[PDB]
Ligand binder design. Structure first.
Ligand code: SAM
Ligand code: ZN
Lengths: 8, 86, 95, 107, 408, 222, 73, 76, 305
């Protein structure tokens, strides 16, 4: 949602 | 006594002089932008040889950059020079 | 008035046949002391160790111009340019 | 740091026992200074430390733990002044630096 | 000094390591001397100037020597009064100009000597010890109640000849005794003359350490260690004991083992002299050295500059190292460089450097009359200094500022 | 008035001489500040090498390791991280693309790690309380990252400067998941040469369901 | 009485006599022995008096600014 | 009572001390936990460097404070 | 404990913005539009002075040795003028208006605010720009330096922030409250005036809701609060200095009512209401024993312990 992330 | 820091004697490697140097290298037409590029090339060559020329003297504790120390600077970079000895 | 480009060939043969030094002495011996200012201050130059630097810088530029003029010729023209000099230095390893 | 094993006294890892032997059975000069192998082992350790640091950095950036020669070429040739010291040399099993000259890309 | 109280912590490290400043002074300079507080930096110059900088914006506040008493020749030394208000300055013009910053460009009083000068060192703001060239005694210049007579008492007992002991060239007053002044001959003996501030002077110590031409003697500010700079390539730190009756012993020696070079200037840390900082002499000496004065080893090397460095000053209030250029004339300056913190952005921020394993508490799933004083200034800072003895701020020249907009 | 006349002869002509004080775009400045209105306005009128480091941190294991011999215990001498002996100069300031951004103060080249992301280590459940609680109090800044899908890393209260990186769907930096010594770390590499004082960018990859970047070729939302 | 000025013009006057005579009387003091380091005072007291002869260049516009002051009201 | 002696580069310890303990008594407890000799330790509280002979009560050290420890590693 | 001595100025006239007593405690500069009224307290003498400024001068700063007055106004002029020798310097740097400034405790670096979220720094003699301090999100109203050392710079502003800066290198150094973001509450009451103390270890703040607090910034929290038994004025604050043990805080209300708070308690002992009762108050200052007052109409009022 608003959590930053790598590769999705 | 007197105190001068030199400025712009690289303009002594003169535009006709880089022409004569080119002639012995066998060239016919020299673009006008060469004369600020050779000066760039020469100023890089002179640095690396003097920095090794000095480092040899400064090791031997002298204030004169003698002719054998210049030659060892050249001999180290695989330019060997043959008229000054050893 | 000669054809442009034939005084050149009359000047190539003249310099290649002789062995005197092509840069003037005093504008060179001053350049060496300017560059030797950086690495040590107030050096003396045993005055045959500037002749040992003309004869190794002149004979370096001339071997570079022989390698520049082969590159300009290879790009199908007869005029060396700074995009040749930078190639000849890049192929020898220097830059 | 210690008093035995002369490298311990300088606080190094590279041996000064082995180096001081190899400076006399190598015939570099007649009499080797007793300070000399220490300074020589200090320079050698520094380079082995610097080249193993940039190797290891490029091993985690390719997700692998141990170091294979492909990392050592990337450590040397991507550096500005370790490539210059190792200019003429050739690292075995060690790839190339990836570059493509500009006019080869399409447009 | 309240920056460092919350800077925050992590600034006490007892040296600076990064060079941060460079006074681009065109007219080359020999001696530099900070103010007693971290405010100003006096720059003893070659052509007879004494430029005085304000250390906060690296640009001068005045250059004294306009009205009266300009050092005509080169200036070798400059010290300050205990507060930072006066300034004794010894140059090669054979004069020793005592300045007053209140009337800035006008010298307060001077005195003609027997030759050029090596140094000056101020014990009380009036009295000052000045080294005359090749004289076996130092003529202490006591600025008396009358401004015309400075009794130049010989700093020597009446009959103790030091011919064979040498010639007085340095004299550094003891900080925590203030009446003994140790003076260095030119053949290795060190005379210790105790002023009564009458003129009796007891020779509390006369001893040869080594057959060298003594260049410089410094004392720790707690008077505990004393280091000497011989003309041999050695620094000899001692351990100083005085109650009078004085006694030293060889703690350690410092030498350039590799390069085997001479030492220009040496300086001690603030509290007890836990650090020595020296500047080497020869070619390729591009960096000041540091020494753990107890262990004896080369702890750190302050690799900032590009060529030899001559004078070293260490004002601990700013924790700075001023160091003049031997060749360029430029004045390198190291400084303890604090980095910023984003934990100053919000009053609940926090800067961690590890991925911390926060452990779960319960409620993550559950939905003033104290003693107030405004009168006392703080007595100490994080270095334990003598703050709250209000330093003599510079009086900005408010007689000549009004023209100073127009043409200097 | 004759007194005022001799002040006026100075004060009439020289106010067309001394008042060369026009530098701005000259907005509506006719009102005085004497009534002291608030005027909440969103009007923005502001602007919108590694050798020594690697040898510096080399001296720290040249010091710390001499006297760690029996103990031992972490106490901050536990190498005092890894992934820090390469960090960079990079600072924070008022950003062109948001409140606070991160800027390369050194001309960093093509594929070169800047900074690891530091903060708390919290799992997916406790993330969702925190994701709603901060918004319930209205912080309105999502400082959580993803290492493996059942744990996140929080950067609201604790953390390193690496939170301050903004978003731009035309990226310059990305964050791979490199493990050191058997836990994951979030390290943030580069894609292009980043200039001196250039702004650092990133894709956040909010998958799946407003981009204030002001750059043309980018999706208006996130 | 012009009490707002006269403190300036007296030290303008001090340049004429007192700063003058402390700088004048060094030079006749030479004339009793005769008339480099033995009496190198010659050239430096022309740099000193350079700052004195440019002092009258600068002490004008400190007294001329006041002429710009009393016409201001 | 409990303190933190949180060291310069970023990590914390948890000690048990009394406010009547000397600083050297606390410096003994760090050495028992780290082997770091007490002579190379400086304990910092409200920016003030605390002395070996003084107690925790003297410097208004309270429950769960964070003390600062700055070791000086010898030599070389 | 404290009472009225004398009123010497008449009320109305031009806009009265600032009143500042010099630290020597005898020379008062009343700041109106482009004219400076100088009032020597000895025989209640008068003196008129006029500057080279054009608009409403919102700021005033005294020299620490009482020999200069500088001022900045909304037209970006930053002028430095002598008290008797007139205009000497000028700086001209800011991209937004200036509200307040302050001298160094050495008098060499006057701090200077802009309204475009940036504090800038000038060395007076060199007249150039030193360090930029742009860490805020509003028109920054008051930037104060402590009286004794010149170490730190506190920045209170219209966004409700109390942020302490550096003066040597110029980074923000401590924050004492939250912003528009990072709480989202209507607890973002803007700050009007931040004043340091005499020694400089405690700060005083006045927020836009007429509530005055005294911060112990070294610890991060508050130790005093002062309320009256919403504002739209940038009213002045001070803390009076009687020779008795208890030195009293003073602020002015929206009206011309000025009560004085016992700072060693949390309450009042006294209130001054017999003056300024027509006009609303914008600034105050003090001296060892001679405190002035001001409002949009410039009635200065001496008081004494
Ligand atoms: C991973 S955090 C970055 C921290 C942010 N730079 C700051 O100053 O706090 C997510 C934040 O980035 C900001 N953001 C996300 N996309 C943006 C965009 N395209 N332009 C400007 N800001 C953006 C939002 O304000 C959100 O609070
Ligand atoms: Zn975008």
């Amino acid at each position: 949602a608003r959590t930053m992330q790598t590769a999705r | 006594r007197h105190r001068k820091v030199l400025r712009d004697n690289i303009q002594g490697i003169t535009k006709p002089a880089i022409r004569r140097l080119a002639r012995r290298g066998g060239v016919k037409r020299i673009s006008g932008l060469i004369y600020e590029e050779t000066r760039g090339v020469l100023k890089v060559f002179l640095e690396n040889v003097i920095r090794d020329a000095v480092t040899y003297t400064e090791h031997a504790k002298r204030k004169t950059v003698t002719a054998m120390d210049v030659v060892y600077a050249l001999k180290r970079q695989g330019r060997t020079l043959y008229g000054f000895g050893g | 008035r000669y054809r442009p480009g034939t005084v050149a060939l009359r000047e190539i043969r003249r310099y290649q046949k002789s062995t005197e030094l092509l840069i003037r002495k005093l504008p060179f011996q001053r350049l060496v002391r300017e560059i030797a200012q950086d690495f040590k201050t107030d050096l003396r130059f045993q005055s045959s160790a500037v002749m040992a630097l003309q004869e190794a810088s002149e004979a370096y530029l001339v071997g570079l111009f022989e390698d520049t003029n082969l590159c300009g010729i290879h790009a199908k023209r007869v005029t060396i340019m700074p995009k040749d000099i930078q190639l000849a230095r890049r192929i020898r390893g220097e830059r | 740091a210690k008093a035995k094993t002369r490298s311990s006294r300088a606080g190094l890892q590279f041996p000064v026992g082995r180096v001081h032997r190899l400076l006399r059975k190598g015939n570099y000069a007649e009499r080797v200074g007793a300070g000399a192998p220490v300074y020589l082992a200090a320079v050698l350790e520094y380079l082995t430390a610097e080249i193993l640091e940039l190797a290891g950095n490029a091993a985690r950036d390719n997700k692998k733990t141990r170091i294979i020669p492909r990392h050592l070429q990337l450590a040397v040739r991507n550096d500005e002044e370790l490539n210059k010291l190792l200019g003429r040399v050739t690292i075995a099993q060690g790839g190339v630096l990836p570059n493509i000259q500009s006019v080869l890309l399409p447009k | 000094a309240n920056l460092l109280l919350q800077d925050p912590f992590g600034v006490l490290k007892e040296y600076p390591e990064k060079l941060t400043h460079t006074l681009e002074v065109p007219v080359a300079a020999v001696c530099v001397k900070f103010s007693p507080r971290g405010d100003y930096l006096a720059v003893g110059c070659s052509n007879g100037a004494i430029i005085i900088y304000d250390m906060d914006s690296l640009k001068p506040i005045a250059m004294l020597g306009t009205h009266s008493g300009a050092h005509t020749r080169s200036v070798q030394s400059v010290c300050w009064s205990n507060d930072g208000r006066y300034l004794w300055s010894s140059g090669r013009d054979w004069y020793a100009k005592l300045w007053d910053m209140t009337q800035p460009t006008k010298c307060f009083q001077q005195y003609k000597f027997d030759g050029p000068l090596w140094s000056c060192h101020v014990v009380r703001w009036n009295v000052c010890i000045v080294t005359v060239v090749e004289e076996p005694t130092a003529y202490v210049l006591t600025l008396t109640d009358r401004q015309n007579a400075f009794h130049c008492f010989p700093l020597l007992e009446q009959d103790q000849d030091i011919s064979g002991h040498g010639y007085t060239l340095v004299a550094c007053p003891h900080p925590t005794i203030e009446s003994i002044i140790i003076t260095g001959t030119s053949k290795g003996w060190i005379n210790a003359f105790q002023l009564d501030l009458e003129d009796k002077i007891r020779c509390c110590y006369e001893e040869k350490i080594a057959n060298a031409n003594i260049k410089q003697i410094i004392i720790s500010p707690s008077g505990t260690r004393i280091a000497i700079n011989g003309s041999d390539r050695t620094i000899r730190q001692y351990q100083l004991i005085v109650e009078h009756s004085v006694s030293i012993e060889l703690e350690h020696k410092y030498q350039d083992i590799i390069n085997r070079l001479q030492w220009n200037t040496i300086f001690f840390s603030n509290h007890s002299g836990e650090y020595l900082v020296a500047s080497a002499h020869g070619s390729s000496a591009h960096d000041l050295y540091l020494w753990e004065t107890s262990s004896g080893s080369l702890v750190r090397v302050l690799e900032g500059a590009d060529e030899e460095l001559l004078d070293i000053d260490w004002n601990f209030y700013s924790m700075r190292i001023a160091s003049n250029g031997f060749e360029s004339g430029w004045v390198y300056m190291w400084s303890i460089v604090i980095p910023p913190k984003w934990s100053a952005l919000a009053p609940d921020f926090e800067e961690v450097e590890e991925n911390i394993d926060y452990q779960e508490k319960e409620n993550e799933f559950d939905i003033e009359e104290i003693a107030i004083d405004l009168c006392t200034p703080e007595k100490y800072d994080v270095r334990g200094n003598d703050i709250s003895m209000p330093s003599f701020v510079i009086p900005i020249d408010y007689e000549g500022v009004i023209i100073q907009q127009h043409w200097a | 008035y004759q007194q005022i006349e001799q002040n006026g002869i100075i004060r009439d002509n020289q106010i067309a001489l001394n008042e060369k004080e026009f530098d701005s775009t000259l907005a509506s400045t006719t009102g005085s500040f004497i009534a002291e209105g608030f005027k909440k306005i969103p009007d923005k009128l502001k602007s919108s090498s590694s050798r020594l480091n690697r040898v510096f941190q080399r001296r720290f294991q040249q010091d710390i390791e001499a006297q760690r011999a029996a103990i031992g215990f972490e106490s901050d001498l536990l190498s005092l991280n890894q992934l820090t002996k390469r960090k960079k100069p990079v600072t924070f300031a008022r950003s062109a693309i948001h409140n606070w951004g991160l800027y390369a103060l050194e001309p960093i080249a093509a594929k070169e790690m800047i900074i690891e992301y530091v903060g708390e280590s919290i799992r997916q459940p406790v993330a969702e309380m925190r994701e709603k609680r901060y918004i319930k109090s209205g912080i309105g800044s999502s400082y959580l990252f993803r290492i493996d899908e059942n744990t996140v890393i929080d950067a609201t209260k604790r953390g390193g400067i690496a939170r301050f990186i903004n978003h731009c769907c035309e990226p310059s930096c990305t964050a791979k998941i490199i493990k050191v010594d058997g836990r994951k770390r979030i390290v943030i590499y580069a894609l292009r040469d980043i200039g001196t004082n250039e702004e650092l960018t990133y894709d956040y990859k909010f998958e799946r369901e407003p981009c204030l970047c002001g750059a043309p070729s980018c999706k208006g939302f996130l | 009485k012009l009490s707002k000025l006269n403190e300036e013009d007296a030290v303008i006057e001090k340049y004429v006599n007192w700063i003058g005579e402390v700088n004048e009387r060094l030079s006749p003091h030479f004339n009793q022995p005769t008339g480099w380091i033995t009496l190198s005072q010659n050239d430096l007291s022309e740099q000193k008096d350079s700052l004195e002869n440019v002092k009258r260049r600068l002490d004008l516009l400190i007294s001329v600014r006041t002429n710009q002051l009393r016409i201001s009201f | 009572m409990q303190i933190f002696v949180k060291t310069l580069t970023g990590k914390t310890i948890t000690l048990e001390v009394e406010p009547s303990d000397t600083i050297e008594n606390v410096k003994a407890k760090i050495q028992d936990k780290e082997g770091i000799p007490p002579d190379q330790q400086r304990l910092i509280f409200a920016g003030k460097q605390l002395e070996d002979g003084r107690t925790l009560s003297d410097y208004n050290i309270q429950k769960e404070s964070t003390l600062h420890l700055v070791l000086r590693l010898r030599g070389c | 404990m404290l009472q009225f001595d004398k009123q010497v100025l008449p009320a109305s006239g031009k806009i009265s913005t600032s009143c500042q007593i010099s630290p020597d405690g005898e020379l008062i500069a009343i700041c109106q539009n482009t004219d400076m009224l100088v009032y020597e307290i000895s025989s209640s003498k008068m003196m008129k002075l006029t500057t080279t400024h054009k608009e409403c001068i919102n700021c005033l700063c005294w020299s620490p040795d009482s020999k200069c007055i500088a001022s900045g106004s909304e037209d970006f002029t930053v002028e430095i003028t002598h008290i008797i020798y007139g205009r000497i310097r000028r700086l001209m740097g800011h991209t937004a208006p200036v509200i307040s400034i302050c001298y160094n405790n050495k008098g060499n670096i006057l701090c200077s605010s802009s309204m475009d979220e940036s504090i800038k720094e000038w060395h007076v003699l060199s007249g150039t720009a030193l360090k930029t301090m742009s860490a805020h999100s509003d028109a920054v109203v008051s930037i104060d330096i402590p009286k004794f050392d010149s170490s730190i710079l506190s920045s209170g502003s219209y966004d409700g922030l109390i942020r302490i800066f550096d003066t040597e290198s110029g980074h923000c150094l401590k924050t004492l409250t939250y912003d528009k973001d990072w709480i989202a509450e209507d607890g973002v009451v803007p700050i009007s005036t931040v004043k340091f103390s005499r020694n400089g270890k405690f700060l005083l703040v006045k927020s836009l809701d007429n509530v005055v607090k005294l911060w112990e910034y070294t610890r991060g929290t508050v130790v005093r609060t002062f309320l009256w038994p919403k504002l739209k004025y940038n009213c002045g604050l001070e803390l009076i200095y009687p020779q008795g043990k208890d030195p009293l805080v003073i602020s002015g209300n929206d009206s011309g009512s000025m009560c004085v708070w016992n700072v060693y308690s949390k309450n009042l002992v006294q209130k001054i209401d017999e003056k300024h009762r027509n006009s609303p108050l914008i600034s105050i200052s003090a001296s060892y024993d001679k405190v002035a007052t001001l409002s949009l109409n410039g009635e200065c009022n001496l008081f004494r312990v």
